[PDB]
Amino acid sequence: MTLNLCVLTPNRSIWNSEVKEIILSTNSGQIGVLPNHAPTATAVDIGILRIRLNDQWLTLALMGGFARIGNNEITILVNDAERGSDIDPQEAQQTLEIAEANLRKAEGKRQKIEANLALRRARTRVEASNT
Amino acid sequence: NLRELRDRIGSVKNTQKITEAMKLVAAAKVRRAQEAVVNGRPFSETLVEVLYNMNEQLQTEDVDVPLTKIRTVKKVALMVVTGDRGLCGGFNNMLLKKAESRIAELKKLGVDYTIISIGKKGNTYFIRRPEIPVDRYFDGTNLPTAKEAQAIADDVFSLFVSEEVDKVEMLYTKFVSLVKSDPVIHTLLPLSPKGEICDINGKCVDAAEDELFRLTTKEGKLTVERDMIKTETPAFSPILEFEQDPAQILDALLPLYLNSQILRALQESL
Amino acid sequence: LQPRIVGEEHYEIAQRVKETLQRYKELQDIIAILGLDELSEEDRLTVARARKIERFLSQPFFVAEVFTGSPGKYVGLAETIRGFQLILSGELDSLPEQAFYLVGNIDEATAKAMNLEMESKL
Amino acid sequence: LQPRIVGEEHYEIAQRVKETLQRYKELQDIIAILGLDELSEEDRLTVARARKIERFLSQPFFVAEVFTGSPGKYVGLAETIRGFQLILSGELDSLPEQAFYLVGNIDEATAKAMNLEMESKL
Amino acid sequence: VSRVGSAAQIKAMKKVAGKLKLELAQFAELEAFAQFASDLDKATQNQLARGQRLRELLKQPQSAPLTVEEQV
Amino acid sequence: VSRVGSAAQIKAMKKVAGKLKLELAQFAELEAFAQFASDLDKATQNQLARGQRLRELLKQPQSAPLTVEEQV
């Protein structure tokens, strides 16, 4: 009747209730899934997912990994994922500000890589919080 | 005095009750830790199934991923995962003592060690001894999360991609037995493209098969038995379409594996 | 309770009962932590046998007939010894635990067990 | 020391001081063997408070100026209740413990804490 | 200890007291766990939680004797 | 202790029981930290398995004394 979704983190299976649509980011930039999709495997970029089942569609920001989608089924391997409602927006925004400030200072070949990937991490947290 | 003797006996009895309570609590915590490892099994079962099929599809000489990229081993990073608190036998002493041999061994090779220390007794060790470099001091944590292994991973991954450090290896105690748990040192980076995980000495297990630790009672006593269930990797779909590039998809995959591994190294140590 | 005094057969059973009873006492802390399923297959058993043995040791008394109403049972030394063989040899593993409670002879527990099954079926 | 005699303000603080010291006395055996870190936050808080409370009770006397070396202080009932209430309240949790040893008033303890901090900076 | 025991108590008291003695007995077994109540399951945690309230019932100010109905 | 320990024994006994006296001395210390090391290498384990068997020899039934030859 529909495709089914299991998103899972290295310690914790987050979303294993099943849905009519999701739409997720990727390194190509954007993709959408609807039921009886052809078998595809996408490396998913860090940044928000949007999932629609029935009435309600909500975004949980998730931190990148892999997403294969088989027959009647999606499974998404992400190293960290949070529901966008469960993060309180303002605190996430504050964290983003801190990350930006540290990035602006942060210097040197590894360190910026860390700063840049941390600010990329922080910026997507509010984008699920607002949405 | 008799009263003094009675007081001493009472205190000793109180101590016996307290230590017994602590032992029970520790056992419960260990059981909880076992449950925690089991919860992350679907992610490492699914990941090694993908990481197998991404290698068996690839078969390409022109593909090189940064995490798996091999560079000359001029310098090595060693991350030390020690216990958070005291009163636990020789667990911390043994690890730091075992850590020293690795640092000592590098001097024979002279390839410029660096230590990332995790946990308080490892932190307080390498603070008071400044004749070692430290990359970073990480807080230890009970109930380790993917949040808390990420800050380890964002350090090491970032540090490793730059060529300053090579063959980052981690030492920690695989929970083999209750009565003894010897430290073992593994080679974290550069992740093997076969996904095989192997120790510094030179024994590599296939990543498809790993053994969880389950604690059960043998006879009267409380024991643990590490038993390995191989997770078979189903073949990838014939009609599967790769969204980015096989080299590119694989590049996204490696951090997940590294993150997953660091989390198990720390969970097992805990 | 020495073998040269009470005979070899009596001594073995008594020693076994103490050991089985002793193991169960040790296991009580463990069972709460790991539960009865998590124990090994020997210790699912020596917990079960210990429970049956504990119940078998309790007996109805002649003096307490006024107070409890159930008739007391004088139990021979042979019927006692024969009873704890059938619990420790495992030939009565299938019986419920409240068939061994406040019965005199080993046969009474089996008889009590059967009646309980009939009542339950009813 | 009964609330009809001394009033319910004095009596509750005199009673709560003893419960804090009683807890600390019980914990002394455990902390030495298991260190301070095996305590709960609640247990640690009482230990920190009891330790502070214990020092506070000490007082320099007019007679023991040859023993203490510091001039003695007279403390009213009011000063003591006011002083003890603050320690129990926790408003003074940030202070070091040696600000409490051999001071008369609570105010003297705070002043001593300021001096200790000044000395520490140098 | 009381040798007379529940012969002394009234019938109303016997029913109420019997539950109380058992709960108190459990709490005296688990005084060592009270520092560690967070790292325990609900059955054990409730027993510690109930036991502490049970101890509070027992406390009384001086010369405030409770009638039997108040004790029941 | 026997103060007159071995001027007491016969020559067969002094030779035979010279081995025995040592093995029990090993086995007091190998039973110590046996559960501490707990993964017994066969240097320790066979000397510990030898020890349990040695203890069995010392066992005897009441009022069944052995002849000197049997003991030897």
Swiss-Prot record, chain A:
Query: Which Gene3D superfamilies does the record associate with it?
Result: 6.10.140.480, F0F1 ATP synthase delta/epsilon subunit, N-terminal
Q: Topology versus the membrane, per the UniProt entry?
A: Peripheral membrane protein
GO molecular function list:
ATP binding; proton-transporting ATP synthase activity, rotational mechanism
Signal peptide from the UniProt entry: none
Any one GO CC term of the record: chloroplast thylakoid membrane
Instruction: State its location(s).
Output: Plastid, Chloroplast thylakoid membrane
Q: Which cysteines are joined by disulfide bonds?
A: none
Keywords of the record, alphabetical order, are: ATP synthesis, CF(1), Chloroplast, Hydrogen ion transport, Ion transport, Membrane, Plastid, Thylakoid, Transport
Single biological process term from Gene Ontology: proton motive force-driven ATP synthesis
- List the NCBIfam families hit by this protein, alphabetically: ATP_synt_epsi
Protein task: Produces ATP from ADP in the presence of a proton gradient across the membrane.
PANTHER family on file:
ATP SYNTHASE DELTA/EPSILON CHAIN, ATP SYNTHASE EPSILON CHAIN, CHLOROPLASTIC
Q: Which family does it belong to?
A: Belongs to the ATPase epsilon chain family.
Subunit comment: F-type ATPases have 2 components, CF(1) - the catalytic core - and CF(0) - the membrane proton channel. CF(1) has five subunits: alpha(3), beta(3), gamma(1), delta(1), epsilon(1). CF(0) has three main subunits: a, b and c.
The name under which this protein is listed is: ATP synthase epsilon chain, chloroplastic
What does the record give as the organism's lineage?
A: Eukaryota, Viridiplantae, Streptophyta, Embryophyta, Tracheophyta
Curated annotation (Swiss-Prot), chain B:
Question: Where does it live in the cell?
Answer: Plastid, Chloroplast thylakoid membrane
Cysteine disulfide links: 198-204
Superkingdom of origin: Eukaryota
The positions flagged as active site in the entry are: 88
Keywords in alphabetical order, please: ATP synthesis, CF(1), Chloroplast, Disulfide bond, Hydrogen ion transport, Ion transport, Membrane, Plastid, Thylakoid, Transit peptide, Transport
What is this entry's stated membrane topology?
Answer: Peripheral membrane protein
The entry's cellular-component GO terms read: chloroplast thylakoid membrane; proton-transporting ATP synthase complex
Q: How is it modified after translation?
A: Disulfide bond; Cys-198 and Cys-204 are known to form a disulfide bridge in the dark which gives rise to an inactive enzyme. Activation can be brought about by a ferredoxin-dependent reduction of the disulfide bond in the light.
Q: Which GO terms describe its molecular function?
A: proton-transporting ATP synthase activity, rotational mechanism
Which sequence ranges are marked TM in the entry? none
User: What family, per the record?
Assistant: Belongs to the ATPase gamma chain family.
Quaternary structure annotation from Swiss-Prot or TrEMBL = F-type ATPases have 2 components, CF(1) - the catalytic core - and CF(0) - the membrane proton channel. CF(1) has five subunits: alpha(3), beta(3), gamma(1), delta(1), epsilon(1). CF(0) has four main subunits: a, b, b' and c.
Q: What does this protein do?
A: Produces ATP from ADP in the presence of a proton gradient across the membrane. The gamma chain is believed to be important in regulating ATPase activity and the flow of protons through the CF(0) complex.
Additional note from the record: Alkylation of Cys-88 results in the inactivation of ATP synthesis.
Q: How is this protein named in the record? A: ATP synthase gamma chain, chloroplastic
Q: What is the lineage of its organism?
A: Eukaryota, Viridiplantae, Streptophyta, Embryophyta, Tracheophyta
From Swiss-Prot, chains C, D:
Q: From the Swiss-Prot or TrEMBL record, what is one GO molecular function term?
A: proton-transporting ATP synthase activity, rotational mechanism
Q: Which residues cross the membrane?
A: none
Name the record gives this protein: ATP synthase subunit beta, chloroplastic
> According to its record, what are the GO cellular component terms?
chloroplast thylakoid membrane; mitochondrion; proton-transporting ATP synthase complex
Keywords of the record: ATP synthesis, ATP-binding, CF(1), Chloroplast, Hydrogen ion transport, Ion transport, Membrane, Nucleotide-binding, Plastid, Thylakoid, Translocase, Transport
Please name the taxonomic classification of the source. Answer: Eukaryota, Viridiplantae, Streptophyta, Embryophyta, Tracheophyta
Q: Name one GO biological process term.
A: proton motive force-driven mitochondrial ATP synthesis
**Subunit comment for this entry?**
F-type ATPases have 2 components, CF(1) - the catalytic core - and CF(0) - the membrane proton channel. CF(1) has five subunits: alpha(3), beta(3), gamma(1), delta(1), epsilon(1). CF(0) has four main subunits: a(1), b(1), b'(1) and c(9-12).
Q: What broad class describes the main subcellular location of this protein?
A: plastid
Its job: Produces ATP from ADP in the presence of a proton gradient across the membrane. The catalytic sites are hosted primarily by the beta subunits.
Swiss-Prot record, chains E, F:
Instruction: Classify the source by domain of life.
Output: Eukaryota
Coiled-coil intervals, chain numbering: none
Localization in the cell: Plastid, Chloroplast thylakoid membrane
**Biological role:** Produces ATP from ADP in the presence of a proton gradient across the membrane. The alpha chain is a regulatory subunit.
Assembly and partners are described as: F-type ATPases have 2 components, CF(1) - the catalytic core - and CF(0) - the membrane proton channel. CF(1) has five subunits: alpha(3), beta(3), gamma(1), delta(1), epsilon(1). CF(0) has four main subunits: a, b, b' and c.
Q: Its family? A: Belongs to the ATPase alpha/beta chains family.
What is the protein name stated in its UniProt record?
A: ATP synthase subunit alpha, chloroplastic
Annotated source species = Spinacia oleracea (Spinach)
Measured against the full-length protein, the chain present covers: 364 to 435 of 507
